[PDB]
Amino acid sequence: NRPNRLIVDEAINEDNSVVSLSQPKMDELQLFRGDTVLLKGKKRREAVCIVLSDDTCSDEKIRMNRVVRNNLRVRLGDVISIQPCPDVKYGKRIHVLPIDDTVEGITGNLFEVYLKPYFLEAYRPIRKGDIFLVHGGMRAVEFKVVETDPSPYCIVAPDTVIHCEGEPIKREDEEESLNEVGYDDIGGCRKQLAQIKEMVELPLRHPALFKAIGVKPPRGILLYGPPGTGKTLIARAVANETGAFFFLINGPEIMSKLAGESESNLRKAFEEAEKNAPAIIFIDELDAIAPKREKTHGEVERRIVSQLLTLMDGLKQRAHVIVMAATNRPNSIDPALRRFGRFDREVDIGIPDATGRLEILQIHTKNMKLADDVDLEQVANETHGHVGADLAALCSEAALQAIRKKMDLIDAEVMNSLAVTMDDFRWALSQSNPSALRETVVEVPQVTWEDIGGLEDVKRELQELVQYPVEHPDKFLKFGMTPSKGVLFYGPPGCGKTLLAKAIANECQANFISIKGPELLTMWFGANVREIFDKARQAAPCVLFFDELDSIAKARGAADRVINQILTEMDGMSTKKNVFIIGATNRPDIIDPAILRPGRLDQLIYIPLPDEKSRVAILKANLRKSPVAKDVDLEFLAKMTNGFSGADLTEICQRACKLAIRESIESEIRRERERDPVPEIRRDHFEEAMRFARRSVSDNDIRKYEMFAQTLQQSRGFGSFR
């Protein structure tokens, strides 16, 4: 429960001793007022304080002062616990740091009046890693403790002999690096960070969790995914939250040595990591360090990977050391590294979602003052396929666009009055280069099932065949049969077959890996299917989308070799792990008859012509600023039954709204000529779009797809298709 962990109030006083939570909170835990408890904080920071808790204050609010929240590295409204340490004493040597931002203006001796009358005969708790601003000599003076020998939960008294240090030096880079990472500084990847915490739960605070499991789950964790997604930031978060001795080495840094000196400091890093009983050692750029053994063209690379492969399993059960590696690409690594003995936890970071990008912008706009005008949500849902460094660059470019429209002077004229607008963010978003685009994305989309008309019985049966094994495991572990994995879609070439799988992924609430047609051919010529199915099994549960299987069958062997490898990896899928596969096709004459056989993609679903109310949900999305189509004859266009060839009634809707845009721009033209544009559309442009209406598919092809109703007759010759 941790009942002492409650929120932080503002300053009622100044010094670290004079903080108050509640005298009942000194009464249930029975901690005395005089004892130096340890108020917890981020980056393992606990501070020594003779806490004067008062019952007249709010019992959930510690009265932490203005310079105390920087010392515990916590904010207002953060949970703080307490740890007693009665082992305090004073030594002759001490080290304090004045800072020229505060103390400069008054001089004298270094234990003079500027700290006397509040630490007269003090024996008050100072702490190494604590900086408190105390006003003295009509001037505010900060006091950072940098060195203390005798049990650093320590005591100093300026009426005794002080080892006073008088160098005023700025540490503003250290001030910005005082926190420098945190769990609050990581957003959008909470499941991955929770998994990382579950993996590193054993070296910190529970080393004796080996009678539960003797595996001590394996030394070696891989972080892979896109580049620039803050894998080093994740490593620093583990580094400063675990509190273990962190011994990271950069890969190019240990590659930059001469011949024979690559083992130098590489063996020494492991020999340094062997000493401390909590110890994590980290390596970056594994692809530069250890490539595939075919690409190891030089002898020094083979020497380096042999030295690493010796040093990994040659050291074992000593101070429970854990290695961790960050890479940008998983299959370029040497396959001898990733196995069951070493380097097994291939967790992936991945690009963030819209909620993830929103959280990244929320934690990036914390240390920046916006103009309080944007929503910070428009940029979130109109950025797609963005890495976190791209979002940092987008915020930087928006701030630079805000800067660029100001007069150049050195005073604080835009320092205090900084203002970033939505138009600056649109300008930064326009001049952006997101290199996470075209990557095989994983997401749960927002295609909102009511938008998809479809057919009711088809939607109901796909709801059965997808969700009802999944969301009812009691009707899937005790009653049922073998699940029919896979479903194929065919019909008219555009009639509502793409978004049905999207809606399935929406109201099944699963991941949706989609590839559309020639992406397989492009990624094969430019293996890849193995990585696709590895990502599909790693992001389980998921629904695969084989959109336009008809398009790759017109490549005809002339690169038909990939579809049998598709069916090779699809037949290498077990019935469990909750993966799902969907095939989509238009012209079923080249259907490649190994598809439809049982054990494979087998569920035939025929998509017919849509219903009369398919036009209604088109007006839900809206993007050209005038009020929507309303109070017109929606169903009477369906009564005329024109345009009644599958989908693509959105062509009629877009044509009518483009006529509306032409009407609006002509109203703007006459308004600009002469010096309420009738925003809502009337029926006339709908009538004119009805005049410029074409059928998308022929009635002969309707007869052809009617003849393809019993298209399950396979493994027979074509017979010329009379």
Place this chain on the structure above:
Amino acid sequence: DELDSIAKARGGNGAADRVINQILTEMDGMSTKKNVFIIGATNRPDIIDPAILRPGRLDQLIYIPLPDEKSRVAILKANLRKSPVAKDVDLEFLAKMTNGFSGADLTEIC
């Protein structure tokens, strides 16, 4: 299995019809002894690449007829699969109307 896929991949004169020849080269690598036994399953005899059917190499050919109607008895008694048997029904009614009477997928009816 899926020898008809290898048979159907002969178009594109990426042919890979010589992989069948590699298989038959490894087939006479097998002696008549060592007690290994090779089984070929196919669905289409016209494109069978008839160098395979040279005698002494897959010499016996078995034509599988239309299947027996009594698959529905043993498709559920011998495979429960977390659901009990179809109690108190007429199983002869299915073969009386001869539903799905060309090949399998009586298990798909189940």
